[PDB]
Design a binder for this molecule. Structure first.
Ligand code: CLA
Ligand code: CLA
Ligand code: CLA
Ligand code: CLA
Ligand code: CLA
Ligand code: CLA
Ligand code: CLA
Ligand code: CLA
Ligand SMILES: C/C(C=C=C1C(C)(C)C[C@H](O)C[C@@]1(C)O)=C/C=C/C(C)=C/C=C/C=C(C)/C=C/C=C(/C=C/[C@@]12O[C@]1(C)C[C@@H](O)CC2(C)C)CO
Ligand SMILES: CC(/C=C/C=C(C)/C=C/[C@@]12O[C@]1(C)C[C@@H](O)CC2(C)C)=C\C=C\C=C(C)\C=C\C=C(C)\C=C\[C@@]12O[C@]1(C)C[C@@H](O)CC2(C)C
Lengths: 73, 166, 164, 85
């Protein structure tokens, strides 16, 4: 994150044989684009939703500086 | 009309300031921004560049009170962000700059704070207005020279690998 | 200009004169929202006192322990879990008993931090200047302790060394 | 103040006290340059070269952000031009 090598958080995502709640077939990534659903739970990837909320957080924090307050801008 | 550029006319916003007003603004940046904000930015750049030039030069010559400090001020950045010193300096710099927002916002709004003024004269090197103006001009000239010098130092020390001559 | 702590900023309107320890330190202008400085001073002084006691307890627990085994843990954060819940609930109930009457007191009084606590009468006979000097001493020591107790907690959570 | 307007163009105060003082001859070419740069950055990050995890290029991203911006710069350029600036 500090080094800017943000791709490292997307390397080695959860495989297609991952059993939810267990380490079998898991990965190490935390923020990924995968799209679709988990092959086992038939639901969105947890790494997809974490990345989604991080992007939403950055966007809303940026957008929260729009209106004027005690600092002239 | 300008003192620095005889061809181009004198900038409209530059009439007199003890910061070294020689009327050098060919692109008219003083019309864009308030002159006070630009002066604060220039003084900040001056001080940062002077500190950085002195630190680069010294740390290449005599800087090793340990093992991780055995670098050549070109690989020093990565080594010392891994060590954790740059993190602490960044924390304190962020605190100082966050305080500086209010200082910049208290000026440009009223008050009386001159650009770049932090009331930091513990040793009282400046006594009266004449000394204050003379040393403000001296500080800004030294800071501009240090900006250019540090630019040269980094560009040369990245274009090759060497010591103080670079 | 008017701030002593930040000699360049001008302090906010509510930072002036009285309420000892006033060094003009409110860059964010938090005092501009509070109706008065009574409640924030009460909170600051409560934090100062709790932090002084916390630092003293940190050091003493580092060096001195009660005869029982349950109080033999040297790490204060580990002692937070090793100590039986009975002792901690007794401490919490004592604090809450002290806190409810002062809860009635703080939100309305002119000096919410003045709890009338002076068993040794260290303030009886002292002049106004001496009393203000004592208040300044208390506030200084409390702010330093707050910084120190937070540093101790952080260094214990980050390195496991409770001291030095 | 009084950002309300009914004439041909709004007063320059609606641009803020940073764009209110930029000559239109500066904003115009700057807006065109920003639009071209942003379009090229968008077409280099995507379209011409397909995006990949290993190829994000903050320059192209930051660049692409100049396309939305460009819109604002040339709107301000027109406002300045119509206000004799
Ligand atoms: C010319 C000045 C200069 C330049 C070019 C850089 C450049 C850089 N610094 Mg840096 N730094 C500087 C001055 C400078 N610094 C100064 C003056 C200090 C304080 C004394 C620091 C303290 C500092 C720390 C503490 C760290 C960096 C890091 C970094 C790198 C991370 C950039 C990134 O990916 O964004 C990341 C993007 C975001 C965080 C959000 C967007 C980058 C190469 C980081 C690193 O690991 O570098 C390898 C890091 O952790 N810098
Ligand atoms: C802009 C100001 C600035 C910045 C960002 C740095 C940044 C740095 N200096 Mg430094 N330095 C500066 C000014 C600065 N210096 C000045 C003005 C002097 C002269 C007193 C020094 C003298 C100095 C020495 C003697 C050493 C550093 C070192 C370092 C590095 C590790 C930090 C550390 O432990 O020492 C802070 C880091 C890259 C160390 C290092 O690894 O350099 C090889 C080191 O040993 N600096
Ligand atoms: C050539 C070096 C130089 C000179 C002549 C000045 C001159 C000045 N500085 Mg300054 N400054 C410098 C470098 C310099 N600065 C650098 C590198 C930094 C970064 C740490 C600062 C940070 C700084 C702050 C934060 C403040 C000043 C202020 C001032 C003014 C009053 C203090 C004084 O007399 O300093 C005299 C300095 C010297 C004689 C340098 C000797 C050091 C030997 C090493 C004066 C115009 C104050 C101000 O704005 O007042 C208007 C103020 O608040 N300076
Ligand atoms: C619980 C903490 C606490 C609280 C409630 C106060 C409250 C107050 N302080 Mg105070 N102070 C504190 C801690 C605190 N202080 C510490 C630790 C220091 C030492 C640095 C000081 C130093 C100080 C000075 C020098 C002065 C005051 C003053 C004041 C009064 C006016 C400012 C105000 O309204 O801010 C209200 C403050 C809060 C509501 C706290 C908000 C919490 C912020 C967001 C802190 C965020 C964390 C912080 C950035 C980092 C902490 C982590 C770690 C590094 C410590 C007010 C009674 C001024 C005074 O006497 O006026 C009468 C004054 O001149 N304080
Ligand atoms: C913020 C205040 C505070 C809090 C929450 C605690 C909390 C705790 N202390 Mg403690 N302590 C404090 C201040 C505090 N202390 C101070 C100021 C001193 C110096 C006299 C001590 C000296 C001390 C010793 C010697 C021991 C504890 C121990 C303990 C733990 C078990 C409770 C006990 O036996 O208390 C005992 C409390 C006292 C002997 C003195 C309390 C004085 C109060 C605060 C003054 C008002 C009455 C508990 C986590 C025990 C433990 O488990 O060690 C890790 C233990 O052996 N404390
Ligand atoms: C039953 C126990 C109890 C009760 C009723 C109170 C009541 C109060 N405390 Mg208090 N306090 C307690 C225990 C208690 N304390 C303990 C054990 C400590 C640690 C030593 C503190 C430390 C403390 C500080 C440092 C401050 C207060 C403050 C306050 C006042 C405002 C609290 C507030 O906003 O409500 C919050 C409402 C809640 C329901 C809190 C729940 C939070 C969860 C349970 C945390 C776990 C109020 C008089 C403040 C004050 O008086 O400012 C003037 C203040 O600054 N307290
Ligand atoms: C009150 C001033 C003060 C002093 C003298 C020290 C002193 C020390 N700190 Mg420290 N610290 C402080 C405030 C302070 N800290 C604050 C306010 C924080 C943030 C809450 C920290 C967070 C902190 C961490 C995270 C660490 C230290 C560590 C250290 C030691 C190196 C040294 C004993 C380091 C250490 O050696 O830990 C044992 C370490 O890892 N401190
Ligand atoms: C038909 C479309 C249209 C037109 C002709 C205008 C016309 C105008 N708008 Mg406007 N606006 C529109 C749609 C439009 N708006 C929409 C859809 C929004 C979002 C709800 C806004 C939000 C908006 C704001 C917030 C402001 C204006 C302002 C203005 C005036 C000056 C604009 C300028 O030069 O800014 C030039 C701006 C820049 C150079 C900065 C770059 C702006 C880019 C586009 C931001 C990109 C990020 C964003 C998320 C995408 C002008 C009368 C300003 C005004 O009237 O002041 C009182 C003003 O402050 N507009
Ligand atoms: C203990 C230690 C290290 C070590 C050891 C041992 C125990 C000693 C020995 C062992 O053998 C090894 C080891 C590792 O353990 C000590 C570390 C060194 C320290 C403690 C020195 C810190 C350096 C300070 C710097 C480099 C700060 C730079 C200043 C800036 C200012 C920025 C400004 O922009 C701001 C924000 C406002 C502007 O207006 C103007 C200015 C002021 C210019 C940054 O630009
Ligand atoms: C306890 C204290 C004061 C206690 C006073 C009390 C109870 C007085 C009570 C009374 O007067 C009243 C109220 C009313 C009177 O009628 C009755 C009595 C009963 C007489 C002040 C502490 C004040 C404590 C202070 C100021 C502490 C500062 C601590 C620092 C700087 C520590 C730094 C470090 O801990 C770090 C940060 C990291 C470590 O690794 C390294 C080091 C260096 C150890």
């Amino acid at each position: 994150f500090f080094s800017g090598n943000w791709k490292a958080y997307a390397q080695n995502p959860d495989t297609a044989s991952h059993i939810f709640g267990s380490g079998e077939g898991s990965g190490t990534a935390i923020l990924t684009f995968l799209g679709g659903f988990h092959p086992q739970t038939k639901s969105l990837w947890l790494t997809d939703m974490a990345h989604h909320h991080l992007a939403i957080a950055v966007l809303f924090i940026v957008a929260g500086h729009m209106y004027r307050t005690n600092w002239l801008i | 009309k300008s003192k620095a550029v005889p061809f181009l006319p004198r900038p409209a916003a530059l009439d007199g300031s003890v910061v070294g007003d020689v009327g050098f603004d060919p692109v008219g940046f003083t019309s864009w921004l308030p002159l006070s904000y630009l002066q604060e930015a220039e003084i900040k750049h001056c001080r940062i560049a002077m500190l950085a030039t002195l630190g680069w030069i010294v740390a290449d010559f005599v800087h090793l009170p340990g093992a991780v400090h055995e670098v050549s001020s070109l690989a020093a950045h990565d080594v010392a962000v891994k060590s954790g010193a740059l993190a602490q300096i960044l924390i304190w710099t962020s605190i100082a700059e966050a305080i500086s927002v209010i200082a910049i916002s208290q000026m440009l709004e009223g008050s009386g704070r001159q650009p770049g003024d932090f009331k930091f004269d513990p040793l009282n090197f400046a006594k009266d207005e004449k000394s204050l103006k003379k040393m403000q001009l001296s500080e800004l000239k030294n800071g501009r020279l240090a900006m250019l010098a540090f630019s040269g130092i980094v560009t040369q020390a990245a274009l090759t690998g060497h010591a103080f001559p670079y | 200009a008017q701030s002593k702590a930040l000699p360049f900023l001008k302090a906010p309107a509510k930072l002036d004169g009285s309420l000892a320890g006033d060094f003009g330190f409110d860059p964010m202008g938090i005092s501009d929202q509070v109706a008065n400085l009574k409640y924030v001073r009460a909170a600051e002084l409560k934090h100062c006192r709790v932090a002084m006691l916390g630092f003293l307890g940190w050091v003493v627990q580092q060096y001195v322990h009660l005869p029982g085994e349950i109080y033999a843990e040297s790490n204060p954060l580990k002692a937070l879990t090793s100590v039986p819940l009975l002792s901690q609930i007794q401490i919490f109930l004592f604090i809450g008993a002290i806190e409810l009457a002062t809860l009635d007191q703080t939100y309305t009084a002119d000096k919410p931090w003045d709890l009338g606590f002076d068993p040794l009468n260290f303030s009886k006979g002292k002049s106004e200047q001496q009393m203000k000097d004592l208040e300044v001493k208390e506030l200084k020591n409390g702010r330093v302790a707050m910084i120190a107790i937070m540093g101790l907690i952080a260094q214990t959570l980050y390195t496991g060394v409770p001291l030095f | 103040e009084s950002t309300y307007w009914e004439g041909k163009a709004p007063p320059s105060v609606v641009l803020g006290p940073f764009l209110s003082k930029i000559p239109s001859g500066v904003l115009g070419p700057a807006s065109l340059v920003a639009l071209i740069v942003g379009s090229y950055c968008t077409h280099e990050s995507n379209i011409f070269n397909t995006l990949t995890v290993d190829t994000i290029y903050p320059a192209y991203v930051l660049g692409s952000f100049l396309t939305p911006i460009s819109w604002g710069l040339h709107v301000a350029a027109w406002i300045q031009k119509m206000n004799k600036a």
